[PDB]
Amino acid sequence: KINKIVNGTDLTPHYLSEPNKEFKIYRYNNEVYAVRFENDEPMDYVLMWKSHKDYKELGKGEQGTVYEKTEDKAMKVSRGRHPREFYEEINLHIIEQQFFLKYHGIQEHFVLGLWNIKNEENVYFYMPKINAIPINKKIDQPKIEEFVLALKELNDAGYWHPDLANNPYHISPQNLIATEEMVKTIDLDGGFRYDKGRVDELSRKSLVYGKDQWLYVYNFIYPPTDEEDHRIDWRVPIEKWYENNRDESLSDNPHTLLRFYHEGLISLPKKLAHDLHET
Ligand SMILES: O=P(O)(O)O[C@H]1[C@H](OP(=O)(O)O)[C@@H](OP(=O)(O)O)[C@H](OP(=O)(O)O)[C@@H](OP(=O)(O)O)[C@H]1OP(=O)(O)O
Numbered sequence: 001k002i003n004k005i006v007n008g009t010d011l012t013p014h015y016l017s018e019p020n021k022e023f024k025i026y027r028y029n030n031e032v033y034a035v036r037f038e039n040d041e042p043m044d045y046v047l048m049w050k051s052h053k054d055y056k057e058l059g060k061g062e063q064g065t066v067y068e069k070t071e072d073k074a075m076k077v078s079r080g081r082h083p084r085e086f087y088e089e090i091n092l093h094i095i096e097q098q099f100f101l102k103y104h105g106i107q108e109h110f111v112l113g114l115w116n117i118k119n120e121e122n123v124y125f126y127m128p129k130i131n132a133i134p135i136n137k138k139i140d141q142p143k144i145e146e147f148v149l150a151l152k153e154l155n156d157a158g159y160w161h162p163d164l165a166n167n168p169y170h171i172s173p174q175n176l177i178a179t180e181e182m183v184k185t186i187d188l189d190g191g192f193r194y195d196k197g198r199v200d201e202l203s204r205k206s207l208v209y210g211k212d213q214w215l216y217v218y219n220f221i222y223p224p225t226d227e228e229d230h231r232i233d234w235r236v237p238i239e240k241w242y243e244n245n246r247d248e249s250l251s252d253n254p255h256t257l258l259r260f261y262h263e264g265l266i267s268l269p270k271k272l273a274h275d276l277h278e279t
Pocket residue numbers: 011014027032050051052053069070073116
């Protein structure tokens with residue numbers, strides 16, 4: 001497919017800054033791809049969305065207005081005003097992140113896309129359309145645990161979600177989507193967050209919360225209880241540890257996770273505790 005895809009329709013000038021030495025955008029068999037080039041030769045590809053070469057509203061509110069351009073592709077209009085080069089840089093980072101997701105087989109859990117900048121005064125965000133389904137907790141637990149373990153794999157690599165769980169006291173469940181087979185997360189039109197070398201108080205705290213983000217989401221949905229089956233407040237023992245272990249996260253110290261887990265102060269996915277216990 002590699003060589004077949006690069007024989008398709010070149011859409012690069014509509015998304016990335018021309019010319020780009022590493023990434024191109026191609027259409028091939030009703031599929032838009034992001035192709036990665038090395039030696040000036042194509043090496044790998046990632047699928048972005050399906051193509052069909054007043055729209056219906058899919059949503060509107062805090063996160064912005066999303067339309068239905070086609071039945072396989074959503075369109076999120078931009079609210080801010082920025083230069084073209086601002087959305088091009090975001091696209092390049094999304095593509096890099098998109099490859100990471102592929103290499104680790106977790107791409108299905110995260111809805112990414114690309115900002116279309118061919119009209120600088122009409123910039124919208126294309127992404128796959130997904131059919132949401134009211135998420136349950138009693139029966140969807142395996143799917144939710146599979147997403148949390150995927151998000152942990154993301155957090156361990158330095159990436160975290162910009163609007164899902166900024167800290168133990170903030171959660172945006174609306175950005176958790178359940179489908180027939182799995183749980184996904186949306187509101188990633190800006191890509192994932194990552195450290196940039198800044199050391200101010202806000203950026204250092206954010207980097208700690210970013211590595212334990214997966215833990216906050218899980219404990220918000222499945223918090224621990226006592227013998228009376230009353231909700232144990234997991235936030236307090238976690239924050240207490242943070243204030244006494246500056247610039248250190250719980251994921252980076254697996255010995256403390258299992259300790260808080262056996263002590264009944266935090267909840268962990270089923271597979272994580274077993275993989276930490278045996279290994
Ligand atoms: O004529 P183009 O410059 O190549 O633009 C097309 C066009 O979108 P617009 O003309 O509205 O900008 C297609 O829509 P149709 O005319 O076929 O209805 C759309 O294909 P979709 O049907 O899926 O919307 C396609 O977008 P894509 O092929 O990436 O999915 C997009 O090309 P661009 O991606 O460059 O905007």
